[PDB]
Design an enzyme around this catalytic site. Structure first.
Site, PDB file in Angstrom:
ATOM      1  CB  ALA B  81      68.503  57.191 -78.612  1.00 58.07           C
ATOM      2  CB  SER B 124      65.565  44.191 -83.398  1.00 56.89           C
ATOM      3  OG  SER B 124      66.198  43.063 -83.130  1.00 56.89           O
ATOM      4  CE1 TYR B 149      68.149  46.075 -78.579  1.00 57.41           C
ATOM      5  CE2 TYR B 149      67.913  43.859 -79.492  1.00 57.41           C
ATOM      6  CZ  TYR B 149      68.219  45.455 -79.580  1.00 57.41           C
ATOM      7  OH  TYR B 149      68.555  46.051 -80.754  1.00 57.41           O
ATOM      8  CE  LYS B 153      65.766  48.523 -80.363  1.00 56.31           C
ATOM      9  NZ  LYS B 153      65.982  49.805 -80.650  1.00 56.31           N
TER      10      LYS B 153
HETATM   11  N1  LIG Z   1      69.431  43.487 -84.605  1.00 58.32           N
HETATM   12  C1  LIG Z   1      69.182  44.331 -83.882  1.00 58.32           C
HETATM   13  O1  LIG Z   1      68.159  44.256 -82.925  1.00 58.32           O
HETATM   14  C2  LIG Z   1      69.537  45.826 -83.983  1.00 58.32           C
HETATM   15  C3  LIG Z   1      71.102  45.688 -84.522  1.00 58.32           C
HETATM   16  C4  LIG Z   1      71.658  46.889 -84.390  1.00 58.32           C
HETATM   17  C5  LIG Z   1      71.298  47.979 -83.958  1.00 58.32           C
HETATM   18  N2  LIG Z   1      69.973  48.089 -83.698  1.00 58.32           N
HETATM   19  C6  LIG Z   1      69.257  49.289 -83.223  1.00 58.32           C
HETATM   20  O2  LIG Z   1      69.783  50.523 -83.917  1.00 58.32           O
HETATM   21  C7  LIG Z   1      69.890  51.506 -82.751  1.00 58.32           C
HETATM   22  C8  LIG Z   1      71.306  52.070 -83.100  1.00 58.32           C
HETATM   23  O3  LIG Z   1      72.351  50.810 -82.722  1.00 58.32           O
HETATM   24  P1  LIG Z   1      73.869  51.144 -82.770  1.00 58.32           P
HETATM   25  O4  LIG Z   1      74.520  49.908 -82.945  1.00 58.32           O
HETATM   26  O5  LIG Z   1      74.193  52.563 -83.500  1.00 58.32           O
HETATM   27  O6  LIG Z   1      74.159  51.542 -81.093  1.00 58.32           O
HETATM   28  P2  LIG Z   1      74.694  52.709 -80.394  1.00 58.32           P
HETATM   29  O7  LIG Z   1      74.997  52.519 -79.141  1.00 58.32           O
HETATM   30  O8  LIG Z   1      76.071  52.907 -81.143  1.00 58.32           O
HETATM   31  O9  LIG Z   1      73.639  54.021 -80.848  1.00 58.32           O
HETATM   32  C9  LIG Z   1      72.632  54.343 -79.689  1.00 58.32           C
HETATM   33  C10 LIG Z   1      73.081  55.693 -79.430  1.00 58.32           C
HETATM   34  O10 LIG Z   1      72.184  56.222 -78.526  1.00 58.32           O
HETATM   35  C11 LIG Z   1      72.549  56.873 -77.252  1.00 58.32           C
HETATM   36  N3  LIG Z   1      71.778  56.713 -76.260  1.00 58.32           N
HETATM   37  C12 LIG Z   1      71.175  55.555 -75.844  1.00 58.32           C
HETATM   38  N4  LIG Z   1      70.433  55.725 -74.815  1.00 58.32           N
HETATM   39  C13 LIG Z   1      69.968  56.885 -74.725  1.00 58.32           C
HETATM   40  C14 LIG Z   1      68.952  57.734 -74.160  1.00 58.32           C
HETATM   41  N5  LIG Z   1      68.095  57.316 -73.373  1.00 58.32           N
HETATM   42  N6  LIG Z   1      68.943  59.118 -74.718  1.00 58.32           N
HETATM   43  C15 LIG Z   1      69.783  59.457 -75.424  1.00 58.32           C
HETATM   44  N7  LIG Z   1      70.887  58.815 -76.430  1.00 58.32           N
HETATM   45  C16 LIG Z   1      70.890  57.675 -75.737  1.00 58.32           C
HETATM   46  C17 LIG Z   1      73.909  56.172 -77.146  1.00 58.32           C
HETATM   47  O11 LIG Z   1      74.935  57.016 -76.407  1.00 58.32           O
HETATM   48  C18 LIG Z   1      74.404  55.831 -78.506  1.00 58.32           C
HETATM   49  O12 LIG Z   1      75.376  57.046 -78.956  1.00 58.32           O
HETATM   50  C19 LIG Z   1      69.514  51.000 -81.455  1.00 58.32           C
HETATM   51  O13 LIG Z   1      68.209  51.234 -81.076  1.00 58.32           O
HETATM   52  C20 LIG Z   1      69.622  49.487 -81.604  1.00 58.32           C
HETATM   53  O14 LIG Z   1      69.050  48.778 -80.660  1.00 58.32           O
HETATM   54  C21 LIG Z   1      69.082  46.912 -83.908  1.00 58.32           C
HETATM   55  O1  LIG Z   2      82.276  36.934 -80.295  1.00 59.40           O
HETATM   56  C1  LIG Z   2      81.350  36.572 -81.125  1.00 59.40           C
HETATM   57  C2  LIG Z   2      80.183  37.288 -81.548  1.00 59.40           C
HETATM   58  C3  LIG Z   2      79.343  36.526 -82.000  1.00 59.40           C
HETATM   59  N1  LIG Z   2      79.321  35.309 -82.271  1.00 59.40           N
HETATM   60  C4  LIG Z   2      78.455  34.754 -83.238  1.00 59.40           C
HETATM   61  O2  LIG Z   2      78.364  35.577 -84.465  1.00 59.40           O
HETATM   62  C5  LIG Z   2      77.001  35.550 -84.793  1.00 59.40           C
HETATM   63  C6  LIG Z   2      76.541  37.110 -84.816  1.00 59.40           C
HETATM   64  O3  LIG Z   2      75.999  37.347 -83.324  1.00 59.40           O
HETATM   65  P1  LIG Z   2      76.317  38.934 -83.192  1.00 59.40           P
HETATM   66  O4  LIG Z   2      76.359  39.173 -81.598  1.00 59.40           O
HETATM   67  O5  LIG Z   2      77.411  39.733 -83.719  1.00 59.40           O
HETATM   68  O6  LIG Z   2      74.866  39.461 -83.633  1.00 59.40           O
HETATM   69  P2  LIG Z   2      73.335  38.801 -83.302  1.00 59.40           P
HETATM   70  O7  LIG Z   2      73.292  37.863 -84.427  1.00 59.40           O
HETATM   71  O8  LIG Z   2      72.943  38.226 -82.344  1.00 59.40           O
HETATM   72  O9  LIG Z   2      72.385  40.110 -83.522  1.00 59.40           O
HETATM   73  C7  LIG Z   2      72.418  41.047 -82.658  1.00 59.40           C
HETATM   74  C8  LIG Z   2      73.045  42.389 -82.867  1.00 59.40           C
HETATM   75  C9  LIG Z   2      72.530  43.477 -82.211  1.00 59.40           C
HETATM   76  C10 LIG Z   2      71.555  43.637 -81.364  1.00 59.40           C
HETATM   77  C11 LIG Z   2      70.903  42.319 -81.041  1.00 59.40           C
HETATM   78  C12 LIG Z   2      70.981  41.259 -81.872  1.00 59.40           C
HETATM   79  C13 LIG Z   2      76.275  34.498 -84.038  1.00 59.40           C
HETATM   80  O10 LIG Z   2      76.213  33.155 -84.619  1.00 59.40           O
HETATM   81  C14 LIG Z   2      77.050  34.685 -82.826  1.00 59.40           C
HETATM   82  O11 LIG Z   2      76.889  33.158 -82.090  1.00 59.40           O
HETATM   83  C15 LIG Z   2      80.593  34.560 -82.213  1.00 59.40           C
HETATM   84  O12 LIG Z   2      80.764  33.358 -82.812  1.00 59.40           O
HETATM   85  N2  LIG Z   2      81.340  35.212 -81.502  1.00 59.40           N
END
Ligand SMILES: NC(=O)c1ccc[n+]([C@@H]2O[C@H](COP(=O)([O-])OP(=O)(O)OC[C@H]3O[C@@H](n4cnc5c(N)ncnc54)[C@H](O)[C@@H]3O)[C@@H](O)[C@H]2O)c1
Ligand SMILES: O=c1ccn([C@@H]2O[C@H](COP(=O)(O)OP(=O)(O)Oc3ccccc3)[C@@H](O)[C@H]2O)c(=O)[nH]1
Ligand SMILES: NC(=O)c1ccc[n+]([C@@H]2O[C@H](COP(=O)([O-])OP(=O)(O)OC[C@H]3O[C@@H](n4cnc5c(N)ncnc54)[C@H](O)[C@@H]3O)[C@@H](O)[C@H]2O)c1
Ligand SMILES: O=c1ccn([C@@H]2O[C@H](COP(=O)(O)OP(=O)(O)Oc3ccccc3)[C@@H](O)[C@H]2O)c(=O)[nH]1
Ligand code: NA
Lengths: 338, 338
Positions: B81, B124, B149, B153
């Protein structure tokens, strides 16, 4: 101005409230009294020369915060409230992040709700982390604070910074404190720690009035002139003054304004002890103990920015810091009354 | 085990629940439904082969978290979440810090109250900041995330870390995600972003399904082999599996267990595009667009640690990621029902 002083019945806050009142501002104190006593109130009033409103409450109560900001028609907020013991922070991190991180978060969130956009933050030299360059300059990048206490402060800075970006109308002051010491010249207000004092000055003071056996000096083999820790000690009255000035000068001036508030000189633990022995007419008792966890050897402030920018600088010497502390401690051996 | 999965109705969490149920664990989902729909629930149960308990609520609500952990006799928490839209985080920093930093704080504070000591956090690759050393290793010092964001994290990481130090009986996994993609092979579950998708995969899939005209590839200039952004794509199913293993193995093992969850290999935007087109059977319409603010040119995970320590690695392929995503997108073009 209509100022809300969180943590206003605390050490720095109370002194600051005195100067504010003296300057004709309308002061509203908000304090949960976890580290202060109501008994300081009448003193602040007497010395302030004007009555400050008091509200017992927690910065973590967002609704309450919103209520106060609105009801009291606040213009600016000086945020002193929080937890501030390094040692304890290590032992109870969550309490630290809650009070410090979340506590500030709640207050600013309330400020947003009430449309208040002037803020002054009680920061800290810890944000610099293990900075080899000394003295510390505001332009230095922040380091990695060792304790949860230190981290919580840096975290708040970052948040306020992000907030100011998202809300460019805000004037936010990040006031980095060093080592505040001393007390109101009246000898009627001063630092009043509960239990074994963590800090230097207070520790010595209790030794001298006989609340403690001997001052334990942490570490004696530091890479310093006398081997003891070196710090930038600042008189709390000077610190107080710097806040009024910052508040008066920065209100409605958008941006994140960062300033080291310090004397800009280092003094060792022994120099401190000598001053004290000097202020109290009798040598202070100390013994050498091992280094304290996370203690840095030496650092102090470069406070030229504030000088340039706020036209502010310190005016009380270490001697007065000590004299004034002794004056308070002796008039009030056990501090403020219940 | 009796598992509280916050954010369990979301993308990653939903897939994770299915896998947990498949192993026969007792699952309780907690989700405020801010970015998910109730309609996913029945699919979870169907695909998982066991009914999950659902509770609609917010992690910021500490009393509720406590009540849940307690009455449910939860022994381990999986914390998905939070908010995760990078760009918006810049515009709405407070909401970010509140849901992520405080939301987690409230959650762990409740854990302590209820005496729960197993936690898994969704971290992340952003914690790495601007790391020129590729791929990323868990031993690397953390960096300075650029958005609220990423900062939230990192902040959570350090808070949890301090907590573990103070309560050394806690088992804390900081699982650093890279770029999750794909969907349950049933094509009955998958990502379902609302509005205009921020991530590459959903966009491509929407283009491919006729929901969008053309994909914008951000930047052609990148110091890469094709000039397009390079990333570590990981199939959500491998990701879910990794969570199950971590939960199973780390339960009751004190420490802060940090692991990159990723494929350990890079693939460009164009690489992914080609994968989909071959998956979907039609060339995916795209174009070039300037660089997207904050984008790093290229990064990927060193996932050997997790292979070594948890005996886990990815088994799904890139084509599988596109193929599965396509299958869900094709099957449920409008996502989950209202
Ligand atoms: N590269 C990255 O940094 C990375 C990439 C993808 C996902 N993640 C992390 O993984 C987790 C899950 O990601 P996801 O893609 O499944 O996202 P998601 O939005 O589908 O899942 C998050 C869920 O939490 C619920 N939620 C949000 N805020 C809440 C709150 N305050 N209380 C209760 N529920 C709440 C939302 O309704 C949602 O269903 C997140 O913490 C996301 O930041 C990190
Ligand atoms: O419409 C889109 C979306 C993303 N990108 C590119 O695709 C790659 C992936 O981007 P992404 O937004 O899918 O993910 P991210 O690499 O930034 O990583 C995340 C994912 C979830 C939370 C925070 C960072 C990057 O080179 C981004 O510039 C595009 O070219 N077009
Ligand atoms: N170098 C440094 O790090 C530096 C040095 C000294 C003090 N400071 C800071 O200055 C500020 C004030 O310091 P001080 O010496 O006056 O401390 P203090 O404890 O005397 O003052 C803090 C006041 O805040 C109150 N308080 C704490 N938590 C609160 C909460 N949740 N809600 C309401 N009130 C609460 C306490 O009751 C007290 O009256 C603090 O933020 C402290 O961290 C920074
Ligand atoms: O009983 C004590 C306490 C402190 N010191 C020394 O005096 C100096 C000042 O320490 P301090 O604890 O009074 O302050 P600080 O330098 O850690 O700075 C603060 C002040 C307030 C809140 C957080 C950090 C240090 O070299 C410290 O090791 C002693 O020798 N004896
Ligand atoms: Na401890």
């Amino acid at each position: 101005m209509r100022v809300l002083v969180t943590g206003g019945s605390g050490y720095i806050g109370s002194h600051t409230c005195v100067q504010l009142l003296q300057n004709g501002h309308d002061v509203i104190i908000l304090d949960n009294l976890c580290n202060s006593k109501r008994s300081v109130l009448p003193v602040i009033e007497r010395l302030g020369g004007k009555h400050p409103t008091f509200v017992e409450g927690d910065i973590r109560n967002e609704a309450l915060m919103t209520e106060i900001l609105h009801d009291h028609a606040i213009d600016t907020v000086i945020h002193f409230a929080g937890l501030k013991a390094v040692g304890e922070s290590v032992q109870k991190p969550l309490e630290y992040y809650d009070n410090n991180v979340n506590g500030t978060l709640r207050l600013i969130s309330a400020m947003r709700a009430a449309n208040v956009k002037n803020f002054i933050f009680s920061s800290s030299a810890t944000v610099y982390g293990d900075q080899p360059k000394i003295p510390y300059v505001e332009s230095f990048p922040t380091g990695t604070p060792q304790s949860p206490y230190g981290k919580s402060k840096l975290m708040v800075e970052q948040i306020l910074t992000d907030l100011q970006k998202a809300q460019p109308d805000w004037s936010i002051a990040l006031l980095r404190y060093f080592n505040p010491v001393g007390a109101h010249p009246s000898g009627d207000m001063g630092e009043d720690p509960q239990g074994i004092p963590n800090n230097l000055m207070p520790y010595i003071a209790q030794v001298a009035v006989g609340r403690r056996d001997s001052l334990a000096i942490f570490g004696n083999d530091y890479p310093t002139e006398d081997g003891t820790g070196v710090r930038d000690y600042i008189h709390v009255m000077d610190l107080a003054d710097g806040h009024v000035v910052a508040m008066e000068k920065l209100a409605n001036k958008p941006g994140v304004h960062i300033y080291n508030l310090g004397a800009g000189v280092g003094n060792s633990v022994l120099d401190v002890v000598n001053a004290f022995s000097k202020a109290c007419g009798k040598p202070v008792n100390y013994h050498f103990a091992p280094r304290r966890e996370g203690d840095l050897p030496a650092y102090w402030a470069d406070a030229s920015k504030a000088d340039r920018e706020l036209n502010w600088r310190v005016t009380r010497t270490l001697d007065e810091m000590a004299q004034d502390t002794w004056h308070w401690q002796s008039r009030h051996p056990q501090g403020y009354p219940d």
